[PDB]
Amino acid sequence: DIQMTQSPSSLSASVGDKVTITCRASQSVTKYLNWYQFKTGQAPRILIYGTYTLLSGVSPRFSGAGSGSLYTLTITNIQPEDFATYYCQQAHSTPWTFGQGTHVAANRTVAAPSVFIFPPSDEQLKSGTASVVCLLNNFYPREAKVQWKVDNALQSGNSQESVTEQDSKDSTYSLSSTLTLSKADYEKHKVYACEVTHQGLSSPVTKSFN
Amino acid sequence: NWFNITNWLWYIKLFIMIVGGLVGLRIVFAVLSVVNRVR
Amino acid sequence: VQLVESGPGLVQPWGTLSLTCRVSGDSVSNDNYYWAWIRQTPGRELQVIGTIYYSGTTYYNPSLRNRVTISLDKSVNVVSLRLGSVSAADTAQYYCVRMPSHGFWSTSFSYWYFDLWGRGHFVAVSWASTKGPSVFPLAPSGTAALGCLVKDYFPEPVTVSWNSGALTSGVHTFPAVLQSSGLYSLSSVVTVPSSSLGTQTYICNVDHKPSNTKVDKKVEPKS
Ligand SMILES: *[C@@H]1O[C@H](CO)[C@@H](O)[C@H](O)[C@H]1NC(C)=O
Ligand SMILES: C[N+](C)(C)CCOP(=O)(O)O
Ligand SMILES: C[N+](C)(C)CCOP(=O)(O)O
């Protein structure tokens, strides 16, 4: 089977930038190289076949080039609807193989997160467990640290985090840190606080309840 | 295996086309029949 | 024009996973197209499972040929996939796909590409049995945030909407997380103007079709 590798694995670009994605093969694929676009909401969508040929309704901003073991997709004037993940595929051999994918995400100005804290629902405390949510809304860049502190004692392991995909219009991320506890332990303590560190914050920001 | 066959057949198609417009086709039949006669 | 894939959400190990793709544009016996199945593992690797022609000819990926079957049903215009002796490693998004068959005299002969894809259909392979989710309010205390915590459900996926589709701007529905218990949990949160809490009611509509669970929970400011 023909090995496919794209470079770079991840990249970021500002709207307007030129973006090139490279696809290298272990053998020569003699121009049987296709490019496809993947967005999370919609069905996958092809954009190029046979190295250069654009399909109808694909913008001519996209253009393909290459030969042998080395191919390249190029986005001329990258627009909001173009941020997505791109795959190359070979049609030369009997078992078709795709590349691993190049994810194109947005670079934009730093934006600090809005921090919220949500206490656990009465209903769920009746059920016998307790979830406490920290929400970090609409921030960039993606990297952010979320510390849990219960009665000034630092926590670890009992909490899980999740992060949304970049917003279609805002171009920013949001993140939920859910802290799950037995009703016992949650009843033990008094003061629950969520500490946030992020590039766009000068001092760590903490939000808390009793 | 077929999808792999097409990668050689494309070159065969190219070959056929270049001798398509360049040696008319009636000429091709005629020389075909010439070869056959030698049999 | 339209390709609708469907099948089970959850399949037991050593079971058989059967999918159907309903084709809503033209007949599957159109001699201009092949059809194919392509799958994506959660590890993002894309794999060609196999192709089938209106005439009956199939190609199967070597690593699966011992245990895969594709077939079309012209009478109802569907294309079916069966995958046997299924393991956890077969948990994937399964796309049904169309592939132009260019005849010899086309300008674009021998160019083989997947030109149209359906939305996909996710299949988890696990011994665990279905489980509907619990829905708990995340109550608000310039702009306020509120939401719904959708905890302890199996398998994926659940869909959360707000005001039956009417509230769309400012919504953030998070990816699920796998808890130690082996069940899934997520949160969905919206930011609204605080002036509106005491006047506008906010309901979240959670749906979990793998267990036929539908729940509508209203989120009121905290007390
Ligand atoms: C975004 O733009 C600035 C401009 O210099 C650059 O330094 C930075 O590396 C970019 N961010 C990323 C993640 O590449
Ligand atoms: C395989 N191919 C025919 C599409 C391209 C190879 O031929 P060429 O374009 O290099 O002359
Ligand atoms: C790519 N194309 C289908 C438009 C033309 C193919 O011709 P060729 O590149 O094989 O000579």
Residue numbers in the entry:
A (entry chain A): 1 to 210
B (entry chain O): 671 to 709
C (entry chain B): 2 to 35, 35A, 35B, 36 to 82, 82A, 82B, 82C, 83 to 100, ...
What does the paper say about this structure?
Crystal structures of LN01 were determined in complex with MPER-TM1, in complex with MPER-TM1 and phosphatidylserine (06:0 PS), and in complex with MPER-TM2 to resolutions of 3.2 Å, 3.1 Å, and 3.9 Å, respectively. The structure of LN01 in complex with MPER-TM2 containing the complete TM region reveals that MPER forms a continuous helix with the TM comprising residues 684–711. The asymmetric unit contained four complexes, two with a continuous straight MPER-TM helix and two with a 90° and 110° kink at the conserved Gly 691 in the middle of the TM region. LN01 interactions with MPER are the same in all four complexes and similar to the LN01-MPER-TM1 structures. The interaction with MPER-TM2 is tighter, resulting in a Kd of 13.0 nM, underlining a role for the complete TM region. Molecular dynamics (MD) simulations of the LN01-MPER-TM2 complex placed into a bilayer with a lipid composition analogous to that of the viral envelope (Brügger et al., 2006) revealed a 25° tilted orientation of the TM segment with respect to that of the bilayer. This tilt orients the LN01 Fab on the membrane such that the HCDR3 dips into the bilayer and positions the lipid-binding sites to interact with lipid head groups. We further observe a bent conformation of the TM region, which has no role in LN01 interaction. Although this may be a pure Fos-Choline-12 effect, bending occurs at Gly positions that are strictly conserved in HIV-1, HIV-2, and SIV TM sequences.
The membrane-proximal external region (MPER) of the HIV-1 gp41 fusion protein is targeted by the most broadly reactive HIV-1 neutralizing antibodies. Here, we examine the structural and molecular mechansims of neutralization by anti-MPER bnAb, LN01, which was isolated from lymph-node-derived germinal center B cells of an elite controller and exhibits broad neutralization breadth. LN01 engages both MPER and the transmembrane (TM) region, which together form a continuous helix in complex with LN01. The tilted TM orientation allows LN01 to interact simultaneously with the peptidic component of the MPER epitope and membrane via two specific lipid binding sites of the antibody paratope.
